Amino acid sequence: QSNDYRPSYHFTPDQYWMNEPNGLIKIGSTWHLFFQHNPTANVWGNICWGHATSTDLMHWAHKPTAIADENGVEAFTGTAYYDPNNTSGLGDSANPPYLAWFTGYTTSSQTQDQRLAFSVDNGATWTKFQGNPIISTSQEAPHDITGGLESRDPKVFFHRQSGNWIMVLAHGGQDKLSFWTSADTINWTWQSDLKSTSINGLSSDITGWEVPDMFELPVEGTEETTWVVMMTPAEGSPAGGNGVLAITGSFDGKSFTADPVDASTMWLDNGRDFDGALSWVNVPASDGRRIIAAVMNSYGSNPPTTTWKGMLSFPRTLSLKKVGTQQHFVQQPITELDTISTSLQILANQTITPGQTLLSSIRGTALDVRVAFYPDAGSVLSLAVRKGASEQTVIKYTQSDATLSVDRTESGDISYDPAAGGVHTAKLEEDGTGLVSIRVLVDTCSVEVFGGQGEAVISDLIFPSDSSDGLALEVTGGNAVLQSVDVRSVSLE
């Protein structure tokens, strides 16, 4: 599109197609990104783990395939962890291994088994464990009614409280996760299932459980920590189809006991294009952040991009905090972004009235725009991004129903998939000072919209013309006082 819609500051594969991220781990000063990669660049292509690294979660260096499809077992999704005590025996005392657990998908038979890979050069190169699979279809069969066709996406971590490795495995349409323990990362023992039917407040509509992650999260603040299970069900999300949710609960080394969920707070995205989220493990406590990323492409082969498909969301923190009085999962872009952004326009304490159009001089396809404002009762504030003569993507705040919306009806090319347009919505309230806050990351083919403290998030692909590079800020049905507007251009170095 002149440039094949390449994002300028989000990760995309150097070539070809990406699905969800895999094996997210920090190793020394290096953030490692792996992902489901399809170098054949058609729907029948074999999957392998692709690989990129960065020191700042933004400037990614492309690396060779980390874990190859071979013999023909494809390298499906999984996770990574450090084995400092060499419990696997795959490294040594001077050189403990980093480990990755992944589903082996045997193309011809469709079996799904669990496999191990290890690195003794701090993540640069990975070797598949000779004894793969580490969990066979036969070992899965008592727990997977398909006999080993529906057991996948292993999340593995070391559980200090019990001294065991834990594996959380997803079972798709069986609508459960299974929990397994190991002393050595290789020999596993099933302990429990987390169903579906055990989670109070979880709709029966939420089916096809995939891509688990699990970690302890501070609950604030209040010195309390909780266990969190994050996953990507295939159905039930606010925008329809796959989406990402998070559940809090307790964990004893053997079973996760879910707290009740509330549907109005459990989903981590209200847009179409945020699926298969994982978090970075091994982050030093001095940093202490829980940082997540997902793939943005809910449309399979349909996006109008030729030399690549699939992009990573911009990394964002996941936290639990009160927003006023209610506990929410809140998400915000990582602060590293502020180092590659520069203000093109700032407003402070500016009144906007119907008929006025602000931000009219801005031109940019890569923007980070913040708007914080006090709306009149019954007003609607509209921020049009990627605006041209006949195109725009409109972010609206409707005061009367406390709703943040992202409208792609006129975004540009919405012909490529039936779900490419329409309007997505999230609940967003004024805070206790009357302030409404909205932030939008704009890139060549995406918007990521964060409401409030990040309790509302809508992430979506858009395909505007390159010339649709304007902004328009307008209000109807009343006035608003814009406490602050900051339009920043974003550029990698």
Of 283, 196, 203, 214, nearest in space to 250 by CA? 214
- Secondary structure letter of residue 463 according to DSSP: -
Please give the biggest Cα pair distance in the chain. 70
Radius of gyration of the chain (CA): 22
Q: Known binder of ligand: residue 19?
A: yes
CB-facing half-sphere around the CA of 215: CA atoms within 13 A: 24
Torsion of the alpha carbons at 425, 430, 435 and 438, rounded to the nearest 10:
-20
What is residue 233's three-state secondary structure? coil
d(Cα 216, Cα 204) in Å, to the nearest integer? 26
302 assigned to a ligand binding site: no
**Between the CA of residue 109 and those of 73, 104, 105, 148, 485, what are the distances in Å?**
10, 11, 9, 10, 56
Nearest CA among 223, 208, 90 for reference residue 152 = 208
Query: How many other C-beta atoms can be found within 10 angstroms of the C-beta atom of residue 86?
Result: 15
Residue listed under structure tokens 């906007």:
352
Tokens 């809090």: give the residue.
Answer: 248
- CATH number for 1-336: choose from 1.20.120.80, 2.115.10.20, 3.90.1150.10, 3.40.50.150: 2.115.10.20
Residue 288 to residues 87, 249, 271, 291, 318, Cα–Cα distance (Å): 25, 20, 28, 9, 11
The continuous run of DSSP H or E covering 387 comes out as: strand 380-387
- H helices within 89-193, ranges in order? 137-140
Per this entry, what is the length of the chain?
493
Beta-bridged to residue 178, according to DSSP, are 169, 193
The answer to whether 30 and 304 have CB atoms below 8 angstroms apart is no
Q: What is the 3-state secondary structure (H, E, C) of the chain?
A: CCCCCCCCCCCCCCCEEEEEEEEEEEECCEEEEEEEEECCCCCCCCCEEEEEEECCCCCCEEEEEEECCECCEEEEEEEEEECCCCCCCCCCCCCCCEEEEEEEEECCCCEEEEEEEEECCCCCCCEECCCCCCECHHHHCCCCCCCCCCCEEEEEEEECCCCEEEEEEECECCCEEEEEEECCCCCEEEEEEEEHHHCCCCCCCCCCECCCEEEEEEECECCCEEEEEEECCCCCCCCCCCCCEEEEEEECCCCEEECCCCHHHHECCCCCCCEEEEECECCCCCCCCCEEEEEECCCCCCCCCCCEECEECCCEEEEEEEECCEEEEEEEECHHHHHHEEEEEEEEEEEECCCCCECCCCCCCCEEEEEEEEECCCCEEEEEEEECCCCCEEEEEECCCCEEEEECCCCCCCCCCCCCCCEEEEECCCCCCCCEEEEEEEECCEEEEEECCCCEEEEEECCCCCCCCEEEEEEECCCEEEEEEEEEEECCC
- Exposed / middle / buried, residue 106 (Cβ in 10 Å: 0-12, 13-18, 19+): middle
**Beta carbons within 8 Å of 287's beta carbon, 6+ residues apart:** none
Active site members: 20
Instruction: Write the CB contacts of 229 (distance below 8 Å, at least 6 apart in sequence).
Output: 168, 177, 194, 212, 213, 214, 246, 247, 249, 256, 258
Q: Which residues, 6 or more positions from 490, have their beta carbon under 8 angstroms from its beta carbon? A: 8, 9, 337, 340, 341, 366, 367, 368, 441, 443
User: For residue 250, which of 229, 227, 231 has the smallest C-alpha distance?
Assistant: 227
Closest by alpha carbon to 267, among 252, 245, 237? 245
Q: Where are the beta strands (DSSP E) in 223-325?
A: 225-231, 245-251, 256-258, 275-279, 291-296, 308-309, 311-312, 316-323
Does residue 224 have a known ligand-binding role?
no
Q: With left for phi above 0 and alpha for psi between -120 and 50, is residue 305 left, alpha or beta? A: beta
Distance CA(78)–CA(62), nearest Å, equals: 20
- Given resolution (angstroms): 1.5
What's the DSSP call for residue 281? Answer: B
**Topology of 337-493 in CATH?**
Jelly Rolls (2.60.120)
CA–CA dist 88, 81 (Å, integer): 12
Q: Where are the alpha helices (DSSP H) in 311-392?
A: none
What does the domain layout of the chain look like in residue ranges?
A: 1-336, 337-493
Q: Quote the DSSP letter at residue 336.
A: G
Distance CA 484, CA 349 (A): 6
* 1-336 against 337-493: fold identical: no
Q: How far apart are CA 460 and CA 479, in angstroms?
A: 28
DSSP state for residue 324 in the 8-state scheme: T
Residues 367, 385: contact at Cβ < 8 Å? yes
Q: Which of 43, 441, 455, 423 is nearest to 240 (CA)?
A: 423
Question: Is residue 38 annotated as involved in ligand binding?
Answer: yes
DSSP assignment of 134-159: SB-HHHHTTT-TTSSSS-EEEEEEEE
Output the six-digit token pair for 253.
């080394």
How far CA 166 is from CA of 152, 160, 215, 422, in Å, comes to: 14, 10, 11, 41
By DSSP bridging, strand 16-27 and strand 308-309 are: parallel
What are the φ and ψ backbone dihedral angles of 323, each rounded to 5 degrees?
A: -115, 110
- CB-CB contact of 407 with 469 (8 Å): no
E-strand stretches of 268-365: 275-279, 291-296, 308-309, 311-312, 316-323, 326-333, 341-352
Name the token pair of 46: 């074999």
Evaluate whether 15 touches 275 at the Cβ level (below 8 Å).
Answer: no
